[PDB]
Ligand binder design. Structure first.
Ligand SMILES: O=C(O)[C@@](O)(COP(=O)(O)O)[C@H](O)[C@H](O)COP(=O)(O)O
Ligand SMILES: O=C(O)[C@@](O)(COP(=O)(O)O)[C@H](O)[C@H](O)COP(=O)(O)O
Ligand SMILES: [Mg+2]
Ligand SMILES: [Mg+2]
Ligand SMILES: [Mg+2]
Lengths: 455, 455, 160
């Protein structure tokens, strides 16, 4: 069935659709499967399955329904581009508070359209949210300002937060775990749970939370500096997430504002993210995206990009989200991913297809992680342009030859080097912990700074 | 770094790992990216990033950690096959009730390993859950038996539940919506909300719920038969899901056991599914999988298959899940997908790589939906072998030329034809609503039953 | 929840899993927390299931939380010693619905990875159907053990 006359209107102007403020706009890279309809026919069926229709005519359709159809307004077949306009009335709203839900956005814009038999593939690269819909999202309640304030840093451009992940990923019992925390905190600021750490039989949650709280008090007494921890509170059960969060805040007591809550938002879903955002709005919500690579990888021609994932996370209310190392670490990622960081931190920014005004919605911190170490950091910051962020180096800190404290100091020193505009090899001559990161990761040192041993 | 000596043990026997009952097993189709390590080296790093390690050595590792490492125990590079054994102690458990969480299973087995820079792709095709871990999952609390009991059908092999989806997908205001419900219920059993229908500004939730309750009462009075509705209660906010569910049960009153709750489990996540399973265990939980195609499509070489998604949904507690049309409808799917239906309904079944014993865990109904209609149903049932399920046909019912009631009756008659072993064209001579489905979908009739017009 | 869920925990077939060997901790009242837990451990070296005697709860000489913790320790030690799963049925009966919840929630959290080895005992005849329903609806994944103390006042054939 050809539904192009109903679901396609290529005479609509994007600038008028934006100015109108009545439509969500999505841009997709799509390819029709061979043997079905042409590009516009396939894009029109895609619009129908993403708004008001199905694959056949139904006699219950009225003119009111036709008015809320999603419309294909722009195509570019040689570049596989399809842009659709979604009337904002289509999106579901809470009965309890009239607010928006990202689950409805996902259901319509990247839901059943991902299982179409006549489409080879379709992936969302950008979306535009107008003011009338944007303002109905939670947005972040806590930001990096609240971490800077706890550290005694300026709340405007407070700078780089030196972090790590406790490694091994799993296996440390409660006291060995808190001993590694204490060691890192002698030189660093922030520690996060590795994403799966929680209530394993060999490291029960309550025993680890108590041991970590004791290690925070001892490290603050020893250094005279505030320390931060991001606990994993992810669970299927909403009530388990509440039980974990409430226990941590009570246990940390006068250090309760030093606590961030980590949620595995991609695998547990938006429902888990919203549970922590709404139950604990005064605690920094750390969005961990484990599993995202199944769709965001450039190897995938389906689902949505990491740029789209990150933009949605700001609307959901993440205080920070992992944006990757932009090609400087161990994971998939490119230098151009710096545009993701600007979209989640600025009040106005450009996406690959759509500019976005955030109307004062709070920023989401880019959390940098994945095979980072002291040696790889100057190149990373040169590409991004600032260090007003959190960087967590698990292997980079606990793989440092002189220990966790020296590991932490090598990361502190690497950002000082970049901030001072110094040559890393020349800088290392007067900074031992940074110099010893060359001997800890010699394969990286040989690649990045060829004659480092002679100097 | 080569981690194959630690994370690979190809001398482990799969039959001994199963007999031991101490490991979750996962089977993946993986391809290393060119220029990094070979197959076993890449599989070992993949196991490290999915359990206890990272991409470099860390000095916090102890022998206790090494004992809980995930291990590559079987490879077949010619078929791109990788099998990993996960010690069950790795998986997170609830502090409140000691039960398992699928978010932890997902985080470890298909989490960060999907963003590996040295892997071209990796997709999970099957998993094995031993008794010690299986018994910690919720499993389904309500089944098709409970629906059959409300319908006055036998609770053992009660038969085919004639279903539809209200179409248009969005656009009907509350009374037109309830009028389409009433019309369908004059000849059918079950109606579900189309996945995005909820609380749109043009069809407020409470007005729609009240209008549908009135239509249920009127259809039951007119026909003398029980009628069922599956309402979408999906939301980001846990408290919105509760508010929707509580309002529906109170409104339906003496018809409250005729209500199923629909959750968009793939986009809202396991957290939303668990909210409905634990808050409303006496209401049939309908798992809608909109968006799954981004990873489950055979065009994707990442994430996991629809077989894996369905198997996880039974552990999560879905009373039913959409299993697709197995190549007989409009979506991607194949005849071999009948094995998904057997895995979720039987007490013992074979997956593509692992045999699974369910230890009396309740079955999950296969919900059949996606471009189905009366004409396509006999072929669908011939491939599956039974009709003890719910089939929903939106376009197939509301696209019937004589209306929703005739649409419903054509679906009822199509399964009666299959059950009687009759020839569909000969059967249509004595069954008008079924015969009129040929005239409603003539392109389908021409392909499936060539000289139908002459007879 | 049914006997299937107890058979599954014991490693028995879920269909016709057979006899569950049980006892009641005696004295009916009087054992302090550690003597109570010592009798649990001793029985579990040869048996499967233990239930609270119907009035045992939070007596001043055997506070509930101390007894629950001592029994959880005895369950862990008996399971380690025998290599077999052990079951306990705790009395959570109370006039106050919120007391029943407080008892049940504390037990599941304390037993942790052994939380599916727990049954909840309710004195359904004296506390009434309201107490039975509190346990059934609040803890549907825990075996609900209905104790009928007092029933004999009407059920006895001596009663007409
Ligand atoms: O488990 C890990 O691998 C990490 O803790 C990094 O540890 P290492 O520092 O030792 O590499 C992070 O979870 C990943 O960076 C997540 O990837 P991403 O940030 O892209 O979402
Ligand atoms: O919106 C739709 O497209 C449907 O209502 C089918 O309606 P029609 O009968 O008119 O086609 C279902 O949601 C899809 O089948 C879900 O996909 P799946 O079952 O594969 O999960
Ligand atoms: Mg991690
Ligand atoms: Mg639908
Ligand atoms: Mg007694």
């Amino acid at each position: 069935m050809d539904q192009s006359n109903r679901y396609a209107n290529l005479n609509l102007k994007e600038s008028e659709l934006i100015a109108g403020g009545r439509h969500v706009l999505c841009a997709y890279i799509m390819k029709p499967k061979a043997g079905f309809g042409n590009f516009i026919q396939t894009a029109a069926h895609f619009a129908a399955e993403s708004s008001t229709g199905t694959n056949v005519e139904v006699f219950t359709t009225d003119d009111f329904t036709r008015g809320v159809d999603a419309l294909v307004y722009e195509v570019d077949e040689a570049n596989s581009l399809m842009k659709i306009a979604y009337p904002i009335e289509l999106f579901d709203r809470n009965v309890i508070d009239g607010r928006a839900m990202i689950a409805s956005f996902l259901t319509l814009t990247i839901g059943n359209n991902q299982g179409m038999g006549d489409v080879e593939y379709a992936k969302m690269y950008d979306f535009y949210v107008p003011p009338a819909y944007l303002k109905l999202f939670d947005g972040p309640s806590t930001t990096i300002k609240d971490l800077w304030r706890v550290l005694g840093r300026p709340v405007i451009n407070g700078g780089f937060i030196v972090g790590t992940i406790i490694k091994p990923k799993l296996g440390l019992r409660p006291q060995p775990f808190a001993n590694a925390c204490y060691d890192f905190w002698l030189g660093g600021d922030f520690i996060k749970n590795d994403e799966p750490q929680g209530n394993q039989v060999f490291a029960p949650f309550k025993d680890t939370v108590r041991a970590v709280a004791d290690a925070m008090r001892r490290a603050q007494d020893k250094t005279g500096e505030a320390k931060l921890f991001s606990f994993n509170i992810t669970a299927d059960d909403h009530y388990e997430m509440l039980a974990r969060g409430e226990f941590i805040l009570e246990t940390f007591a006068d250090n309760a504002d030093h606590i961030a809550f980590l949620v595995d938002g991609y695998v547990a879903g938006p429902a888990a993210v919203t549970t922590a955002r709404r139950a604990f709005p005064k605690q920094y919500l750390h969005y961990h995206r484990a599993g995202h690579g199944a769709v965001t990888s450039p190897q995938s021609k389906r689902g949505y990009t990491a740029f789209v994932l990150s933009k949605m996370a700001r609307l959901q209310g993440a205080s920070g989200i992992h944006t990757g190392t932009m090609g400087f670490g161990k994971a998939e990622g490119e230098a151009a991913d710096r545009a993701i960081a600007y979209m989640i931190t600025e009040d106005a920014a450009d996406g690959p297809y759509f500019h976005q005004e955030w109307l004062g919605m709070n920023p989401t911190t880019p959390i940098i992680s994945g095979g980072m170490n002291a040696l790889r950091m100057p190149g990373f910051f040169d590409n991004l342009g600032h260090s007003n962020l959190i960087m967590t180096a698990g292997g980079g800190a606990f793989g440092h030859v002189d220990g966790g404290a020296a590991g932490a100091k090598s990361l502190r020193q690497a950002e000082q080097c970049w901030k001072q505009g110094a040559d890393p090899v020349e800088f290392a001559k007067d900074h031992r912990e940074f110099a010893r990161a060359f001997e800890s990761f010699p394969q990286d040192a040989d690649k990045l700074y060829p004659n480092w041993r002679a100097k």
